[PDB]
């Protein structure tokens, strides 16, 4: 089983430097280029850059955008991808991938990006790092919605979950709106009516950048 | 090399043909391999994207009948022979012969039967309140096409200030939106009036859907 999975995201100030990592498993990984790919909120993927297998000395090749500011490496030993990025500004905020190219030295041979990781969002801000407040939205027939408001946080991303992901059928959860620094969204599901209150209904807010989380059981008024 | 998408987004219906534009600023084509190095992935949202062609015309494993590649040297082209609720999604392309760069994209979305909303109220939460803050939430569920109007009446009077809106993507079972209204005064705000109206407005009627509640209950 191919796995990618990328690190270091977060929070960010204007001018400093960041690290990300990617870690790797289930192939030979030093039979592998590694490409980085950014995408801006919103906006297209960007190619930033790649660092090429074993058979061709592990050589970097980076994107006009980014030369002289970023900097692709690799653990060997280890199987980790290295993406560093120095004087950031606003216009790197992004969610960064690592990507598996083209492994032409050894096995099957084809040129695209086979697998990638979940992503991490940067983002640059001289804000600060607010974790989310998570209150219930409950009623004043044979279904009801319910639904966690989350207010107040910074930067993004958050994520919800209901059950603890074993809910997951009629779950709408709308796009983050920016207000006065702060993000907010609001996550719902429709349930049976049978369901609740007679059963147990919770979300699970996730906020990556402060690393908490946070569950909210939703009670009847 | 330039990469250039087209068209940035459009809309069909589930079934219909489609087809979507790539044009590189220089030949694709590799002399030495004999292969155009153009690939196409699909990003549906908050996903990763994903591999479907690469070399231009070859599909990737798993991927349906449903898509196809063609084009060579500098003009590409994605083709959904009958698409379906799962292809939401924006499909960019990348050429990999010189360094990797990838498209504007091309966003696909589905037309589909209007459907009304199903709109429901929601009155702040006690902790919310307990911390001084009072968030009315309007949710409208389930309806098409996207635009929509809400407005918000309290105590029979009409309010704009304080008024937040956010919709979902296009759903991927049934290609419909959602989208909530979240009216944020101060605890106090709140306790100085008691009707909480919030009036949806679409094109599947010309009388709105009201939904209404009293704080002293
Ligand atoms: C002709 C240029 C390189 O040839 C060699 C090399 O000299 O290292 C040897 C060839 O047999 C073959 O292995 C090629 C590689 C080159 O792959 C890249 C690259 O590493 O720069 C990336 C690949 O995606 C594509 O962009 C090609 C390009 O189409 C031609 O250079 O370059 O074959 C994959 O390397
Ligand atoms: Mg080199």
């Known amino acids: 089983e191919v796995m990618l999975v990328e690190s270091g995201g977060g929070l960010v100030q204007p001018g400093n430097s960041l690290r990300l990592s990617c870690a790797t498993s289930g192939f030979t990984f030093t039979d592998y280029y590694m490409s980085w790919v950014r995408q801006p909120p919103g906006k297209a993927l960007e190619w930033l850059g790649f660092?090429?297998?074993?058979?061709?000395?592990?050589?970097?090749e980076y994107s006009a955008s980014v030369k002289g500011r970023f900097t692709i490496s690799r653990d060997n030993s280890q199987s980790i991808l290295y993406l560093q990025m120095n004087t950031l500004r606003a216009e790197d905020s992004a969610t960064y991938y690592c990507?598996?190219?083209?492994?032409?030295?050894?096995?099957?041979?084809?040129?695209?990006?086979?697998?990638w990781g979940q992503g991490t969002l940067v983002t640059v801000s001289a804000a600060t790092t607010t974790a989310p407040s998570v209150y219930p939205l409950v009623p004043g027939g044979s279904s009801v919605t319910l639904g966690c408001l989350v207010k107040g946080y910074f930067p993004e991303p958050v994520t919800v979950k209901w059950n603890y992901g074993a809910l997951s059928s009629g779950v709408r959860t709308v796009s983050s709106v920016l207000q006065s620094g702060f993000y907010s969204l609001s996550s719902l599901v429709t349930v049976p009516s049978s369901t609740w209150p007679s059963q147990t209904v919770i979300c699970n807010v996730a906020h990556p950048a402060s690393k908490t989380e946070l569950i909210k059981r939703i009670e009847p008024r | 090399i330039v990469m250039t998408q087209s068209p940035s987004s459009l809309a069909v219906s589930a079934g219909e043909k489609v087809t979507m534009s790539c044009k590189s600023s220089q030949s694709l084509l590799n002399s030495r391999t004999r292969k155009n190095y153009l690939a196409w992935y699909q990003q549906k949202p908050g996903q990763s994207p994903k591999l479907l062609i690469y070399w231009a015309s070859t599909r990737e494993s798993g991927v349906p009948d449903r898509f196809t590649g063609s084009g060579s040297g500098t003009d590409f082209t994605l083709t959904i022979s009958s698409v379906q609720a799962e292809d939401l999604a924006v499909y960019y392309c990348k050429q990999s012969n010189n360094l990797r760069t990838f498209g504007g994209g091309t966003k696909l979305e589905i037309k589909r039967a209007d459907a009304a909303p199903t709109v429901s109220i929601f009155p702040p939460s006690s902790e919310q309140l307990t911390s001084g803050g009072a968030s009315v939430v309007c949710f409208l569920n389930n309806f098409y096409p996207k635009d929509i109007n809400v407005k918000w009446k309290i105590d029979g009077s009409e309010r704009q200030n304080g008024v937040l809106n956010s919709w979902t993507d296009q759903d991927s079972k049934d290609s419909t939106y959602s989208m909530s209204s979240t009216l944020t005064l101060t605890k106090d705000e709140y306790e100085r009036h008691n009707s909480y109206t919030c009036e949806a407005t679409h094109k599947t009627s010309t009388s709105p859907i009201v939904k209404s509640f009293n704080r002293n209950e």
């Open positions: 990507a598996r190219d083209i492994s032409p030295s050894y096995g099957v041979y084809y040129e695209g990006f086979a697998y």
């Open positions: 660092i090429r297998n074993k058979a061709k000395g592990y050589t970097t």
